[PDB]
C-alpha cells in the first residue's frame, strides 16, 4: 500500500498516492471529476478520475463495475485504457471511492478541427478504425462515438474514450445526437457494432468539409437530413425495423433516391468519397466493418495488417445479472485489488 495524501480540489477531497503530483482540474465538469497530474513513477502526464458516489444505488454500483471492467480490458494504442486504479480504503468495509488513471491527452477532436488536409483525415480516421477494430473484436459497442470523446496528443496520436457506457440532452440542435446512426436515434431495432461505423462516417465527413454532416434541429429534422443524403429505405430494410410504430412513420415519408456523394463532398479525394459511401449506408447489415475499412485503398499509406491487433474475449455476462449494491461493490473491489499495471 502506497502512502496517500489529501487535497481539496473539485470541491471535494482527493486522496491519492504520493506518486501523483501537481493535481489540477481539467475541463471543469465536461469529463466529470477529472484532474491532470504528473506520475513520478512512470514520468507520464496522467488524467485521474474520481468516481462520484459510486455505490449510491444499484444502477450506480453496476455502472461503476461496468466502467472498471471496460477500462481494465482495453489494451490498445488507440483506446483509453487503465494505467492505474486505486482506493484509499484499506478494506471492503470502508471502500467508497474509486480513482481511475489513464494518459493525459492534449485536446479532443472538437476543439482542434476546421476543414483538415486529406493526409490528416487519413491518419485520424485510420486510428479511430484501428481502435474500433480492437473494441469490436471484444464484442463491445461504443454507442456514442463523436469528436468530443476522441482525444488527441500533439503528434496527432488518437485514443477513443467513453466506450460501452437522458432524453433532454439528446433533444434539439445538439452535438450529442448528430453522430448517431438512424436505427439507434429512433430505436428502430436491436443494433449492431456498425452503429459506430455510422458515427465514423459522420466524423470523417466533418473533418473533410469542416461542417457537421447531419446537424438536425431535432430527431425528425435530423432523420430527414440523413434520408436526403442516403435515400429512403426500401422494402428490404423496412422488414428489419421491428418497431411497427417507427416502421409506420418511415412509410409516410416521400421516397428519395441516394445522392451522389461526389456532388456532396466536392473536391475531396475520390477514395475518401468511396469510403464514406460504404460507411454511410442506411441498412446497418450492409455497412463496412472496421476491419474491412482498414483494408480500404484510402488507408494505403498507414494500413499494416500485422500492426492492427484484436482484443482478448470480453465476458459481459454480468450485464444480464441482477445483484444488490453490496454485491456490485464487492465485485468492483475485487477488480481494484486484482489490478496489475501495464509494463
Ligand atoms: F480520467 C480518466 C481516467 C480513466 C478513464 C477515463 C478518464 O477520462 C478522461 C477525460 C479526459 C481526458 C483527457 C483530456 C485532457 C485534456 C483535454 C482533453 C482530454 Cl479528452 N486526457 N485523458 C483523459 C481521460
What is the DSSP secondary-structure string of 29-56?
BTTBSEEEEEETTTTEEEEEEE-SSTTS
35 lines ligand 1 (CB under 6 A): no
Method: X-ray
Documented resolution in Å: 2.0
246 plus 123 within the same structural domain: yes
What distance in Å separates the CA atoms of residue 297 and residue 285, rounded to the nearest whole number?
Answer: 22
Ligand 1 center to residue 31 CA distance, Å?
7
Ligand 1 center to residue 236 CA distance, Å?
42
User: How many Cβ atoms from other residues are within 10 Å of residue 262's Cβ?
Assistant: 13
Q: Is 31 annotated as a binding residue?
A: yes
Burial of residue 283 (number of CB atoms within 10 Å: 0-12, 13-18, 19+): middle
225 plus 113 within the same structural domain: yes
> Which residue in this structure is represented by grid cell 441482477?
322
Using alpha carbons, list the distances in angstroms from residue 119 to 116, 125, 269, 272, 286.
8, 10, 10, 11, 27
Q: Which H or E run includes 103?
A: strand 99-103
172 plus 306 within the same structural domain: yes
127 plus 67 within the same structural domain: no
Q: What is the 3-state secondary structure (H, E, C) of the chain?
A: CCCEEEEECCCCEEEEECCEEEEEECCCECCECEEEEEECCCCEEEEEEECCCCCCCHHHHHHHHHHHHHHHHCCECCECCCCEEECCCCCCCCCCCCEEEEECCCEECHHHCCCCCHHHHHHHHHHHHHHHHHHHHCCCCCCCCCHHHEEECCCCCEEECCCCCCCHHHCCCCCCCCCCCHHHHCCCCCCCCCHHHHHHHHHHHHHHHCCCCCCCCCHHHHHHHHHHHHCCCCHHHHHCCCCHHHHHHHHCCCCCCCCCHHHHCCCCCHHHHHHHHHHCCCCHHHCCCHHHHHCCHHHCCCCCCCCCCCCCCCCCHHHHCCCCHHHHHHHHHHHHHCCCCCC
Given a contact cutoff of 8 angstroms between Cβ atoms, the answer to whether 16 and 48 are in contact is yes
Considering just the CA atoms, what is the radius of gyration of the chain in Å? 21
Dump the DSSP string for 158-183: EEE-STT---GGGSSS-TTTTT--HH
State the greatest distance between any 2 C-alpha atoms of the chain, in Å, as a whole number. 67
179 plus 297 within the same structural domain: yes
Secondary structure letter of residue 76 according to DSSP: B
Which domain CATH number covers 271?
1.10.510.10
**Domain interval for residue 238:** 107-310
What distance in Å separates the CA atoms of residue 286 and residue 70, rounded to the nearest whole number?
Answer: 28
* Phi and psi at residue 143, to the nearest 5°: 85, -20
327 plus 303 within the same structural domain: no
- Hey, which residues does 45 pair with through a beta bridge? 38
5 plus 16 within the same structural domain: yes
Residue nearest to atom 10 of ligand 1 (CA): 31
Q: Which of 157, 266, 167, 260 is nearest to 211 (CA)?
A: 266
3-state class (DSSP) for residue 255: coil
Of all residues in the chain, what percent are helix, strand and coil, respectively (each to 5)?
40, 15, 50
Q: How far out from the chain centre does Cα 188 lie?
A: 21
Q: Which of 123, 74, 127, 18 is nearest to 311 (CA)?
A: 74
Which domain CATH number covers 55?
3.30.200.20
Q: Which three cell numbers stand for residue 105?
A: 491527452
51 lines ligand 1 (CB under 6 A): no
User: How many Cβ atoms from other residues are within 10 Å of residue 264's Cβ?
Assistant: 15
Q: How many domains does the chain have?
A: 2
183 plus 306 within the same structural domain: yes
Residue 315 annotated in active site: no
- The angle subtended at Cα 4 by Cα 80 and Cα 325, nearest 5°, is 65
What distance in Å separates the CA atoms of residue 86 and residue 257, rounded to the nearest whole number?
Answer: 55
Q: Which of 97, 162, 167, 315 is catalytic?
A: 162
Using alpha carbons, list the distances in angstroms from residue 62 to 32, 48, 93, 202, 206.
18, 21, 18, 31, 35
81 plus 195 within the same structural domain: no
User: How many Cβ atoms from other residues are within 10 Å of residue 234's Cβ?
Assistant: 11
Q: Inter-axis angle of helices 325-337 and 58-73, to 10 degrees?
A: 20
What distance in Å separates the CA atoms of residue 105 and residue 341, rounded to the nearest whole number?
Answer: 19
52 plus 81 within the same structural domain: yes
What distance in Å separates the CA atoms of residue 44 and residue 41, rounded to the nearest whole number?
Answer: 8
Which numbered atom of ligand 1 lies nearest the CA of 151?
A: 20
98 plus 121 within the same structural domain: no
User: How many Cβ atoms from other residues are within 10 Å of residue 303's Cβ?
Assistant: 17
Given a contact cutoff of 8 angstroms between Cβ atoms, the answer to whether 308 and 296 are in contact is no
What distance in Å separates the CA atoms of residue 268 and residue 206, rounded to the nearest whole number?
Answer: 12
Q: Is 32 annotated as a binding residue?
A: yes
User: Which residues, at least 6 apart from 325, have a Cβ–Cβ distance to it below 8 Å?
Assistant: 55, 57, 58, 61
295 plus 320 within the same structural domain: no
Amino acid at each position: 500500500r502506497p502512502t496517500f495524501y489529501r487535497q481539496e480540489l473539485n470541491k471535494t477531497i482527493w486522496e491519492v498516492p504520493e506518486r501523483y503530483q501537481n493535481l489540477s482540474p481539467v475541463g471543469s465538469g465536461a469529463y466529470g471529476s477529472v484532474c491532470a497530474a504528473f506520475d513520478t513513477k512512470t514520468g507520464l502526464r496522467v488524467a485521474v478520475k474520481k468516481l462520484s458516489k459510486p455505490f449510491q444505488s444499484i444502477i450506480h454500483a453496476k455502472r461503476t463495475y461496468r466502467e472498471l471492467r471496460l477500462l481494465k480490458h482495453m489494451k490498445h494504442e488507440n483506446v483509453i485504457g487503465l494505467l492505474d486504479v486505486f482506493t484509499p480504503a484499506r478494506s471492503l468495509e470502508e471502500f467508497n471511492d474509486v480513482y481511475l488513471v489513464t494518459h493525459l491527452m492534449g485536446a479532443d477532436l472538437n476543439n482542434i478541427v476546421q476543414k483538415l488536409t486529406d493526409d490528416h483525415v487519413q491518419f485520424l480516421i485510420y486510428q479511430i478504425l484501428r481502435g474500433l477494430k480492437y473494441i469490436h473484436s471484444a464484442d463491445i459497442i461504443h454507442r456514442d462515438l463523436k469528436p468530443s470523446n476522441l482525444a488527441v496528443n500533439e503528434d496527432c496520436e488518437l485514443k477513443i474514450l467513453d466506450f460501452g457506457l437522458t432524453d433532454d440532452e439528446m433533444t434539439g440542435y445538439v452535438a450529442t445526437r448528430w453522430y448517431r446512426a438512424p436505427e439507434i436515434m429512433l430505436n428502430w431495432m436491436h443494433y449492431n457494432q456498425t452503429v459506430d461505423i455510422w458515427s465514423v462516417g459522420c466524423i470523417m465527413a466533418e473533418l473533410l468539409t469542416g461542417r457537421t454532416l447531419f446537424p438536425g434541429t431535432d430527431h425528425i429534422d435530423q432523420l430527414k437530413l440523413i434520408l436526403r443524403l442516403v435515400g429512403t429505405p426500401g422494402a428490404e430494410l423496412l422488414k428489419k425495423i421491428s418497431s411497427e410504430s417507427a416502421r409506420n412513420y418511415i412509410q409516410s415519408l416521400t421516397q428519395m433516391p441516394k445522392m451522389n456523394f461526389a456532388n456532396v463532398f466536392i473536391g475531396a479525394n475520390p477514395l475518401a468519397v468511396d469510403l464514406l459511401e460504404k460507411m454511410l449506408v442506411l441498412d446497418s447489415d450492409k455497412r463496412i466493418t472496421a476491419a474491412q475499412a482498414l483494408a480500404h485503398a484510402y488507408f494505403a499509406q498507414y494500413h499494416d495488417p500485422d500492426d492492427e491487433p484484436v482484443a482478448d474475449p470480453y465476458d459481459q455476462s454480468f450485464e444480464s445479472r441482477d445483484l444488490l449494491i453490496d454485491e456490485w461493490k464487492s465485485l468492483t473491489y475485487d477488480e481494484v485489488i486484482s489490478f496489475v499495471p501495464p509494463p
